[PDB]
Design an enzyme around this catalytic site. Structure first.
Site, PDB file in Angstrom:
ATOM      1  N   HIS B 243      -8.488 -13.218  -2.695  1.00  0.00           N
ATOM      2  CA  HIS B 243      -7.143 -12.918  -2.240  1.00  0.00           C
ATOM      3  C   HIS B 243      -6.347 -14.212  -2.142  1.00  0.00           C
ATOM      4  CE1 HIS B 243      -3.861 -11.281   0.233  1.00  0.00           C
ATOM      5  NE2 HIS B 243      -4.272 -10.095  -0.181  1.00  0.00           N
ATOM      6  N   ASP B 293      -9.291  -3.383  -2.640  1.00  0.00           N
ATOM      7  CA  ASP B 293      -9.593  -2.698  -3.901  1.00  0.00           C
ATOM      8  C   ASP B 293     -11.067  -2.321  -4.088  1.00  0.00           C
ATOM      9  OD1 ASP B 293      -6.883  -3.015  -4.666  1.00  0.00           O
ATOM     10  OD2 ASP B 293      -7.309  -4.956  -5.605  1.00  0.00           O
TER      11      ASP B 293
END
Lengths: 358, 358
Positions: B243, B293
């Site tokens: 991220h 995700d």
């Protein structure tokens, strides 16, 4: 520190285009844009932007046949066309047809080749006229004009110069939108559809569709001064003027102003736009100058195109620049993911609905 | 200096969401996202994001009836549906239907309300099943599930929590794409269509569609170590991990991991994903952690949704955040127009084609 608008922020390295905002010059891979607009063609300049070199006689010939062979819309797309409303904005029409399902460059070449077909077909359809299929014996621009009006005219040269002038210009809002989307490794169509959305805005390419109505609102050269002063008082944005990078004349606007002066000197729209420039520049109003949207819009109008297609005409050319940038950028990709300064509340509790202040 | 990727660059001030990447916390206008995911509903949290306050009993009731009254697709859209290919990606389907032609907030509310109808209708259509019209007596999420499968199940609660967790997260790539487009004052649909394109990318929301296949490629918990080491050597991006902002666990991923642990502990996909996290985190591989995700994709799979709809499911929720940001940003607009560092050639002459190096 907040950098709202990202002015002056370099988001990448590029060898595609040099934008000299201080001296009002624009170059495509080193060549002045006006040189290409005057001496080149859509296919030759597009080739130059995508491949990095001017094509030889045989290369250009083969490239022209390639683009000409990519002008068809799939049979299924045609089926969808005849079930669409007849009052859609052309930018939206482009989005629709791009969203029905090296190699990336080949893809860019094909999508650019079909843009005029999408526009021409929808134009004919929306007006209840028979479609005019793409002609492989005609050039990219000649063919667009023919699919639109079923005839060929010398005015085509002026339209071609205009497209060349609009093909590329660094990291403008629409090119940037395409890059943000491209940075997630999304498909080329997605990048383009986002770019189209940005180009459509009144503060971007869409200003071209706002100019004609603004010029008519002014009415005549005698009313320019009053209109400008009114705009300053109301802090109303004067369409066709201003730029994030150019600190002086926009070379593309200068080129197109000459085109109009030489071919449509008596156009009422042109007379008003010219007077508007005279007043704003001579009085140094806000130190702003005309940008390409002021005259490109007038030219498109005089060439007989519908006003709600002006932004799509811009896109027909700029798609070349958009794709060139996407290709270059992803060759060494980096996700674009900034942030913000949080100014909202902190430590807020979730109050059960029955206890909330009525 | 070049700021490729724009990491750490604050492009605006926002009171919508606080993203604490250091401590792995996410808040919607001050309230922890997990609190809302656990105690709220789609309509209540959406109301909170758009209006800035938790709704009273009557406000929520009226707001739920409003969204429920906005679930219909125009008759013309239905006509287009039955002429579309049956193998389109759902994100593209959304683009199509959004491109057929205060108040901005009302517009946001209406577009968000119809998202599930677009997806459900295309699902039924693509599979040759009769359409199941929106039911006004059902909630936003209940209704989506019903238009999809013609039945109601307790699993709906899990899907609702998932949507809430995905509604908003600062200036991520898709929200940023919407803002760039919005900064030109383009229409809300254009902003959304660009955001959809960005969310679709494998380096963004699209990673959710890549996780299932990646998990299957690994095959089992016994093969995790070998797969990870292989990825490091090939410099292959491990989907579902990493991220730009979180420097530790993603709170949304943690929440969804618990959901799966409690409701689908025996899912082969979940077992593999859990083992992948164990290996990567315990060995501190690249100091990366699971992002939403990884588990959202597993949940969607176990809930019975098609893999090529996973990104669209993300969008069904995130459209709320996208629109909230667009609205906030344009209330004090600023065109987003950066630039680049030119590294291309200079002073290049246009050589007539007959004199070009063969």
């Amino acid at each position: 520190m907040i950098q709202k608008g990202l002015e002056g922020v370099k988001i990448c390295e590029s060898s595609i285009c040099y934008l000299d905002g201080i001296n009002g010059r624009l170059y495509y891979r080193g060549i002045p844009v006006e040189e290409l607009a005057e001496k080149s063609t859509f296919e030759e300049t597009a080739y130059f932007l995508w491949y990095g070199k001017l094509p030889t006689k045989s290369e250009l010939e083969e490239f022209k046949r390639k683009m000409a062979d990519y002008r068809e819309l799939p049979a299924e797309a045609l089926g969808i066309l005849y079930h669409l409303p007849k009052n859609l904005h052309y930018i939206d029409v482009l989005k629709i047809f791009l969203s029905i399902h090296e190699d990336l460059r080949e893809k860019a070449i094909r999508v650019a080749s079909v843009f005029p077909t999408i526009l021409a077909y929808y134009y004919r359809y929306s007006k209840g006229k028979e479609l005019i299929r793409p002609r492989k014996d005609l050039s990219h621009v000649e063919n667009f004009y023919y699919m639109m009006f079923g005839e060929r005219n010398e005015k085509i040269r002026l339209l071609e110069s205009a497209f060349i002038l609009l093909m590329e210009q660094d990291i403008n809002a629409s090119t940037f939108a395409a890059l943000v989307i491209a940075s997630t490794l999304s498909d080329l169509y997605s990048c383009i559809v986002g770019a189209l959305g940005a180009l459509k805005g009144p503060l971007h390419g869409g200003a071209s569709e706002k100019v004609p109505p603004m010029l008519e609102e002014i009415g005549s050269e005698d009313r320019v001064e009053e209109f400008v002063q009114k705009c300053l008082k109301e802090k109303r944005k004067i369409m066709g003027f201003g730029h994030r990078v150019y600190k002086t004349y926009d070379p593309r606007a200068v080129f197109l102003k000459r085109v109009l002066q030489e071919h449509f000197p008596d156009s009422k729209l042109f007379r008003i736009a010219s007077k508007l420039e005279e007043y704003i520049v001579s009085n140094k109003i806000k130190n702003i100058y005309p940008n390409v949207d002021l005259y490109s819009s007038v030219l498109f109008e005089e060439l007989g195109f519908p006003r709600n297609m002006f932004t799509a005409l811009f896109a027909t050319a700029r798609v070349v620049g958009w794709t060139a940038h996407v290709i270059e950028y992803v060759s060494d990709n980096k996700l674009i993911r900034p942030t913000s300064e949080y100014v909202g509340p902190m430590d807020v509790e979730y109050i059960p609905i029955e206890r909330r202040d009525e």
